[PDB]
Design a protein around this motif. Structure first.
Motif, PDB file in Angstrom:
ATOM      1  N   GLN A 252      42.830  37.395  41.272  1.00  0.00           N
ATOM      2  CA  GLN A 252      42.516  38.062  42.351  1.00  0.00           C
ATOM      3  C   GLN A 252      42.727  39.614  42.499  1.00  0.00           C
ATOM      4  O   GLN A 252      42.063  40.501  42.802  1.00  0.00           O
ATOM      5  CB  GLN A 252      43.101  37.266  43.546  1.00  0.00           C
ATOM      6  CG  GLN A 252      42.290  35.979  43.949  1.00  0.00           C
ATOM      7  CD  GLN A 252      40.849  36.244  44.376  1.00  0.00           C
ATOM      8  OE1 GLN A 252      40.694  37.300  45.074  1.00  0.00           O
ATOM      9  NE2 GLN A 252      40.114  35.245  44.378  1.00  0.00           N
ATOM     10  N   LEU A 253      44.022  39.783  42.038  1.00  0.00           N
ATOM     11  CA  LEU A 253      44.805  41.167  42.007  1.00  0.00           C
ATOM     12  C   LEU A 253      43.887  41.714  40.955  1.00  0.00           C
ATOM     13  O   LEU A 253      43.408  43.116  41.199  1.00  0.00           O
ATOM     14  CB  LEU A 253      46.278  40.955  41.494  1.00  0.00           C
ATOM     15  CG  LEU A 253      46.728  42.334  41.205  1.00  0.00           C
ATOM     16  CD1 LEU A 253      48.176  42.318  41.984  1.00  0.00           C
ATOM     17  CD2 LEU A 253      46.765  42.632  39.822  1.00  0.00           C
ATOM     18  N   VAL A 254      43.724  41.397  39.501  1.00  0.00           N
ATOM     19  CA  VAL A 254      42.984  41.889  38.489  1.00  0.00           C
ATOM     20  C   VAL A 254      41.441  42.332  39.007  1.00  0.00           C
ATOM     21  O   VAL A 254      40.968  43.171  38.313  1.00  0.00           O
ATOM     22  CB  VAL A 254      43.056  41.497  37.049  1.00  0.00           C
ATOM     23  CG1 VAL A 254      41.957  40.414  37.099  1.00  0.00           C
ATOM     24  CG2 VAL A 254      43.071  42.384  36.165  1.00  0.00           C
ATOM     25  N   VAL A 255      41.175  41.399  39.959  1.00  0.00           N
ATOM     26  CA  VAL A 255      39.559  41.830  40.202  1.00  0.00           C
ATOM     27  C   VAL A 255      39.481  42.892  41.481  1.00  0.00           C
ATOM     28  O   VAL A 255      38.794  43.774  41.512  1.00  0.00           O
ATOM     29  CB  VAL A 255      38.941  40.159  40.871  1.00  0.00           C
ATOM     30  CG1 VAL A 255      37.817  40.583  41.726  1.00  0.00           C
ATOM     31  CG2 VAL A 255      38.482  39.548  39.683  1.00  0.00           C
ATOM     32  N   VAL A 256      40.459  42.735  42.453  1.00  0.00           N
ATOM     33  CA  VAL A 256      40.591  43.670  43.796  1.00  0.00           C
ATOM     34  C   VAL A 256      40.940  44.921  43.258  1.00  0.00           C
ATOM     35  O   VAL A 256      40.827  46.040  44.062  1.00  0.00           O
ATOM     36  CB  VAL A 256      40.994  43.102  44.832  1.00  0.00           C
ATOM     37  CG1 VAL A 256      40.666  41.439  45.177  1.00  0.00           C
ATOM     38  CG2 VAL A 256      42.546  42.919  44.623  1.00  0.00           C
ATOM     39  N   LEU A 257      42.072  45.235  42.078  1.00  0.00           N
ATOM     40  CA  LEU A 257      42.351  46.505  41.861  1.00  0.00           C
ATOM     41  C   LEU A 257      41.435  47.412  41.347  1.00  0.00           C
ATOM     42  O   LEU A 257      41.529  48.698  41.562  1.00  0.00           O
ATOM     43  CB  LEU A 257      43.549  46.276  40.875  1.00  0.00           C
ATOM     44  CG  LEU A 257      44.959  45.964  41.354  1.00  0.00           C
ATOM     45  CD1 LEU A 257      46.142  46.051  40.420  1.00  0.00           C
ATOM     46  CD2 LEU A 257      45.102  46.960  42.595  1.00  0.00           C
ATOM     47  N   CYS A 258      40.192  46.909  40.852  1.00  0.00           N
ATOM     48  CA  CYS A 258      39.159  47.800  40.027  1.00  0.00           C
ATOM     49  C   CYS A 258      38.733  48.533  41.434  1.00  0.00           C
ATOM     50  O   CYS A 258      37.996  49.633  41.361  1.00  0.00           O
ATOM     51  CB  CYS A 258      38.182  47.190  39.512  1.00  0.00           C
ATOM     52  SG  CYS A 258      39.034  46.037  37.895  1.00  0.00           S
ATOM     53  N   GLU A 259      38.446  47.929  42.545  1.00  0.00           N
ATOM     54  CA  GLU A 259      38.173  48.485  43.767  1.00  0.00           C
ATOM     55  C   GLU A 259      39.213  49.334  44.435  1.00  0.00           C
ATOM     56  O   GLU A 259      38.690  50.264  45.202  1.00  0.00           O
ATOM     57  CB  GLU A 259      37.431  47.515  44.730  1.00  0.00           C
ATOM     58  CG  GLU A 259      36.247  48.206  45.756  1.00  0.00           C
ATOM     59  CD  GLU A 259      37.023  48.256  47.059  1.00  0.00           C
ATOM     60  OE1 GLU A 259      37.922  47.445  47.451  1.00  0.00           O
ATOM     61  OE2 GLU A 259      36.718  49.253  47.701  1.00  0.00           O
ATOM     62  N   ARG A 260      40.217  48.766  44.483  1.00  0.00           N
ATOM     63  CA  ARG A 260      41.416  49.609  45.333  1.00  0.00           C
ATOM     64  C   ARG A 260      41.910  50.802  44.724  1.00  0.00           C
ATOM     65  O   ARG A 260      42.671  51.386  45.388  1.00  0.00           O
ATOM     66  CB  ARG A 260      42.356  48.411  45.664  1.00  0.00           C
ATOM     67  CG  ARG A 260      42.378  47.408  46.534  1.00  0.00           C
ATOM     68  CD  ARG A 260      42.560  48.020  48.014  1.00  0.00           C
ATOM     69  NE  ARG A 260      41.982  47.271  49.070  1.00  0.00           N
ATOM     70  CZ  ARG A 260      40.888  47.225  49.588  1.00  0.00           C
ATOM     71  NH1 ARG A 260      39.874  48.237  49.205  1.00  0.00           N
ATOM     72  NH2 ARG A 260      40.565  46.394  50.574  1.00  0.00           N
ATOM     73  N   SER A 261      41.607  50.864  43.368  1.00  0.00           N
ATOM     74  CA  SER A 261      42.302  52.105  42.634  1.00  0.00           C
ATOM     75  C   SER A 261      43.457  52.191  42.687  1.00  0.00           C
ATOM     76  O   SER A 261      44.125  53.349  43.181  1.00  0.00           O
ATOM     77  CB  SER A 261      41.453  53.268  43.053  1.00  0.00           C
ATOM     78  OG  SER A 261      40.004  53.143  43.212  1.00  0.00           O
ATOM     79  N   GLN A 262      44.301  51.158  42.547  1.00  0.00           N
ATOM     80  CA  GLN A 262      45.800  51.155  42.590  1.00  0.00           C
ATOM     81  C   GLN A 262      46.456  50.160  41.262  1.00  0.00           C
ATOM     82  O   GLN A 262      47.189  49.314  41.301  1.00  0.00           O
ATOM     83  CB  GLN A 262      46.356  50.543  43.880  1.00  0.00           C
ATOM     84  CG  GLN A 262      46.244  51.720  44.960  1.00  0.00           C
ATOM     85  CD  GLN A 262      47.010  51.297  46.372  1.00  0.00           C
ATOM     86  OE1 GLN A 262      47.139  49.962  46.404  1.00  0.00           O
ATOM     87  NE2 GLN A 262      47.075  52.111  47.385  1.00  0.00           N
ATOM     88  N   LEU A 263      45.985  50.703  40.093  1.00  0.00           N
ATOM     89  CA  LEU A 263      46.517  50.176  39.044  1.00  0.00           C
ATOM     90  C   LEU A 263      47.655  50.546  38.256  1.00  0.00           C
ATOM     91  O   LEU A 263      47.793  50.201  37.238  1.00  0.00           O
ATOM     92  CB  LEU A 263      45.230  50.107  38.028  1.00  0.00           C
ATOM     93  CG  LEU A 263      44.056  48.850  38.205  1.00  0.00           C
ATOM     94  CD1 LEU A 263      42.785  49.374  37.516  1.00  0.00           C
ATOM     95  CD2 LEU A 263      44.593  47.710  37.446  1.00  0.00           C
TER      96      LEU A 263
END
Lengths: 332, 91, 182, 84, 294
Positions: free
Chosen positions: A13-24
């Motif tokens: 879930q983190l690796v999916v939503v970080l692409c949109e949250r821009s907080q990698l």
């Protein structure tokens, strides 16, 4: 979270939503303990399933490896990234990306501990982009690492150095003329040396030959041909060949007002002979034959040097050009 | 030739199955069947070379559709078509 | 588009280890064409010898096409009676071409009363066999068309002060040869 | 010297488990080990590893087997010493 | 190629490699397949005209040695089809001449014979360094040739065809230009005076020992500069009795005398452009069957 199933679900879930949250950047900011291998496997599975070069999964993996002190993993990640870039783009941008990937992989291989001197490389592939649409992005497949088919390779350091030398030679050839990229990539070391000699890069050709462990006979023949052209041509030939002769490092310690291409080539040959001795004077016989093919007498300094260093091979080679009086006074 | 040619280039995006599922030409199973029946009945071709060329082109199209596409029903006359072509001298 | 010079496994830009798709990879049709070209270059029939030379002369139209044909004939490295000179084959290398030229020159010298001596532009007195003459003129025309389409071969073969093919070719031109060879 | 320099590495690389087990069973005779030197320090590790792998596979196939797991742990903790 | 003169040209034990040592400043080794030839090795590292050469057995190590007119001994070793540097010696009273290894029954001991006044024997032990044996005050003018002698010859010791293993010690002969012939035997842990003889007052070219595979008779055929030939025969036990007998003398410059690989045919080459190929007949005598032109 204690259960590994829910832990992996939350990681996905983190690796999916970080692409949109821009907080990698959290994995690089705070250290990842007790879940480094898990997140590495998750990122690897996500990269193998979806995405290619649009996302920065390989860049994030390289950054995490650099932060957590991992050289071989960073090297293989950069190798996979370069493979993906080569599969995607193939023109000048693809060549630049391949060169940068080779450079970064050589750096990751050299930055290892001195106790090691090898590296392993398997095979891999990538496909698709985002799992929230129709499957099958393009008509392409992946590669599986099979130990029975000799898929896994063991690379040392000399092979990587030769590969990077070939890459920089192809880069120089493309900079000279950007239309023969595939030709420079498919050609061999001898063809590359011949092309460099025909262009006017004797130093780079000598470096290529010394890296590939060959012979400088072709470069020496080209230099002898250029010297013959300089001796036979007027001031126009000197002015036309100065642009190619000045790129061979003409920083010798000579007298002033020495603006002569003949003297420049003589000093270049002297410096080459002083900095790299011949194997068994075979290059000397090669230059002698090249000069006899044109029919120009040998220079006085080289004649004196050869008379001081030998005596018999000159008489043995004079029979090719049928020089009677010269051999007569020599034997006298 | 340009009317018979349709192309075979794919796409480089995820949203491509929804566009490729609405194919044309090949969806008409009656036109291809009628063409195959007419070619099996063999129209009165007064030119043996032209007849061999037509048969070879049809065999090549059938083999290409069989090796690339899959929305077909029958494609086994390529060998006798090529035999008739090489017998009638197409080249 | 006929035969790729870099093979289905592209040397430029590192790839993976899979092959069997199109677009991103060389298609199956291109792979089959490359395999057929390799088979035809490895085995040349005596009846298809001259047709293969005509096909190569036709394909040499264009600079990149002639360069790719030259690279193909240079990579075609074999040693067989069905692949070298007569009885099917093609000039596999400039060294083999010069060897065949010097063999034909020795045959002409043996046919002529003079041995190892050039002559002047006189009426022809050639005694070489018809098959050898046809093969020689076909190879010469093929090489001429190849270099004229890809002038890069001209400058690549010019830098040969030790080999010296110019003296041999001018001697062959001065010797008594038919007008087409002239 | 030939086996200890090439055969074990080649078997580990190319997954030649059958050939490795056959060669080990052929060379595990007491006369050869008593006549040659360095064998009990070079090939004994590979023999013990092969035996441990075989017993672990047999245990995984037969589910529970304490009588075999005891000898497995014994041989494992005995091998865990010749790394020096 | 080889445009200049060619000295020696040996072949591999199987019949694949051909090592031709000539004075053309190039040592080319081709291949033997389908009656053709393809260049596979190009070695060059000498300073003068290369002379003799000798091969070895692959079971003991693929090692080659080459002598030249430069007082330098060059040795190469074969690995993965490529010969690299091994042992390079330099500095003598004169240039090295003869060079050969001991037979497979002994080991891989090389013999260096030259007109230097002394004898320097090289012994290859282990897998790295070597040993040098120096024998001085043994030749007034100098050596010339050294021919090895295996211990598997029943003509030297009458105890081989009786289920008895003979001794495997070093034994050979020497015939330098010091007007004296001599025998060398590795006794007392070193080398000393074994058996000397006086049969000439000038130079002696070479010698050839008979490597008999089933003939219980040890023979040595010599050759001098003035066409002199000596046939020393032995068929006793323990101590041998070399008989300085004569056969077919000459007046020119007889050079080489070489025995077959199984002691069957003798080849004599000098200044007559004829190589008389002798052979032992069934009557215990000699007979020449074939000739050749030079």
């Amino acid at each position: 979270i204690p259960d590994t199933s829910r832990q992996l679900d939350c990681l996905r879930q983190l690796v999916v939503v970080l692409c949109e949250r821009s907080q990698l950047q959290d994995l690089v900011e705070f250290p990842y303990v007790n879940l480094h291998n898990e997140v590495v496997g998750i990122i690897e599975s996500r990269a193998r399933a979806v995405d290619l070069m649009t996302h920065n999964y390989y860049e994030l993996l390289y950054a995490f490896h650099i932060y957590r002190h991992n050289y071989r993993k960073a090297g293989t990640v950069m190798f996979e990234y370069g493979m993906r870039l080569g599969r995607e783009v193939r023109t000048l941008r693809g060549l630049q990306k391949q060169v940068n990937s080779y450079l970064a992989c050589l750096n990751c291989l050299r930055l290892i501990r001195p106790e090691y001197a090898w590296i392993v490389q398997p095979v891999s592939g990538a496909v698709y982009e985002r799992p929230g649409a129709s499957p099958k992005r393009n008509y392409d497949g992946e590669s599986s690492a099979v130990p029975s088919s000799s898929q896994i390779e063991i690379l040392e350091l000399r092979d990587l150095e030769k590969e990077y030398v070939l890459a920089q030679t192809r880069l120089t050839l493309a900079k000279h003329n950007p239309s023969t990229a595939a030709i420079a990539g498919s050609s061999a070391a001898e063809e590359m040396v011949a092309l460099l000699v025909q262009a006017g890069l004797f130093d780079t050709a000598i470096s290529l030959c010394q890296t590939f462990k060959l012979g400088l006979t072709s470069i020496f023949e080209g230099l002898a041909c250029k010297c013959i052209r300089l001796q036979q041509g007027g001031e126009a030939a000197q002015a036309e060949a100065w642009e190619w002769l000045a790129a061979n490092q003409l920083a010798t310690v000579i007298t002033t007002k020495e603006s002569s291409a003949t003297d420049e080539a003589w000093r270049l040959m002297i410096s080459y002979l002083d900095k790299y001795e011949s194997k068994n004077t075979l290059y000397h016989h090669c230059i002698i034959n090249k000069l006899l093919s044109h029919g120009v007498p040998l220079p006085n300094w080289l004649i004196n040097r050869y008379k001081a260093m030998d005596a018999a091979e000159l008489l043995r080679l004079y029979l090719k050009y049928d020089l009677l009086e010269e051999a007569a006074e020599l034997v006298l | 030739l340009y009317c018979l040619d349709v192309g075979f280039l794919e796409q480089g995006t995820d949203d491509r199955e929804e566009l490729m599922k609405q194919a044309s030409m090949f969806m008409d199973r009656q036109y291809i069947a009628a063409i195959h029946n007419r070619l099996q009945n063999t129209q009165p071709w007064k030119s043996p070379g032209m007849q061999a060329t037509v048969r070879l082109a049809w065999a090549l199209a059938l083999r290409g559709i069989s090796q690339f596409s899959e929305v077909l029903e029958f494609s086994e006359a390529d060998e006798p078509m090529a035999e008739i072509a090489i017998g009638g001298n197409v080249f | 588009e006929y035969w790729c010079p870099t093979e289905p496994l592209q040397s430029t830009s590192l790839m993976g280890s899979f092959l069997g798709v199109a677009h991103q990879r060389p298609p199956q049709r291109q792979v089959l064409l490359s395999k057929f070209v390799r088979q035809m270059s490895d085995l040349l029939p005596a009846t298809l010898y001259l047709p293969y030379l005509k096909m190569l002369r036709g394909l040499a139209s264009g600079p990149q096409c002639a360069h790719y044909c030259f690279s193909l004939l240079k990579a075609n490295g074999g040693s067989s009676a069905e692949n070298l000179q007569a009885a099917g084959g093609s000039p596999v290398s400039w060294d083999h071409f010069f060897h065949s030229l010097m063999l034909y020159h020795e045959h002409l010298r043996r046919d002529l009363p003079n041995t190892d001596n050039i002559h002047q532009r006189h009426p022809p007195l050639r005694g070489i066999t018809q098959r050898e003459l046809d093969g020689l003129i076909a190879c010469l025309q093929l090489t001429c068309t190849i270099i004229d389409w890809s002038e890069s071969a001209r400058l690549a073969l010019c830098e040969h002060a030790q080999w010296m093919p110019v003296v041999v070719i001018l001697g062959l031109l001065q010797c008594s040869i038919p007008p087409l060879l002239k | 010297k030939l086996v200890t320099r090439h055969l074990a590495a080649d078997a580990v690389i190319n997954e030649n488990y059958r050939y490795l087990r056959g060669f080990l069973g052929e060379l595990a005779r007491p006369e050869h080990c008593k006549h040659i030197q360095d064998w009990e320090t070079a090939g004994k590790v590979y023999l013990d590893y092969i035996s441990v792998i075989e017993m672990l596979n047999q245990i995984r196939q037969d589910e529970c087997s304490g009588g075999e797991l005891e000898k497995l742990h014994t041989k494992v903790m005995s091998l865990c010493k010749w790394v020096e | 190629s080889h445009e200049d003169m060619i000295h020696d040209a040996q072949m591999d034990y199987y019949g694949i490699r051909l090592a031709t040592c000539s004075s053309d400043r190039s040592v080319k080794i081709f291949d033997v397949k389908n009656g053709g030839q393809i260049l596979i090795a190009d070695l060059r590292g000498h300073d003068g005209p290369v002379w003799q050469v000798a091969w070895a057995h692959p079971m003991y190590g693929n090692i080659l040695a080459s002598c030249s007119y430069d007082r330098k001994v060059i040795i190469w070793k074969e690995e993965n089809g490529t010969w690299e540097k091994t042992y390079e010696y330099t500095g003598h009273d004169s240039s090295v001449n003869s060079v050969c290894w001991a037979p497979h029954d002994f080991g891989l001991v090389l013999a260096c014979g030259s007109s230097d006044g002394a004898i320097s024997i090289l012994t290859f032990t282990g897998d790295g360094p070597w040993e040098v044996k120096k024998i001085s005050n043994a030749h007034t003018i100098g050596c010339n040739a050294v021919s090895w002698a295996p211990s598997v010859i029943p003509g030297s010791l009458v105890d081989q065809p009786s289920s008895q293993k003979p001794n495997y010690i070093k034994r050979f002969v020497s015939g330098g230009c010091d007007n004296l012939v001599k025998i060398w035997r590795e006794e007392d842990g070193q080398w000393k005076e074994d058996q000397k003889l006086e049969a000439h007052s000038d130079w002696v070219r070479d010698v050839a020992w008979a490597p008999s595979i089933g003939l219980p008779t040890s023979t040595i055929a010599s050759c001098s500069q003035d066409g002199r030939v000596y046939i020393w025969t032995s068929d006793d036990a323990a101590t041998n009795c070399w008989t300085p007998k004569l056969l077919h003398k000459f007046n020119d410059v007889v050079w080489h005398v070489s025995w077959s690989i199984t002691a069957n045919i003798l080849a004599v080459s000098g200044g007559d452009n004829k190589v008389t190929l002798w052979k032992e007949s069934v009557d215990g005598q000699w007979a020449c069957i074939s000739d050749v032109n030079k």
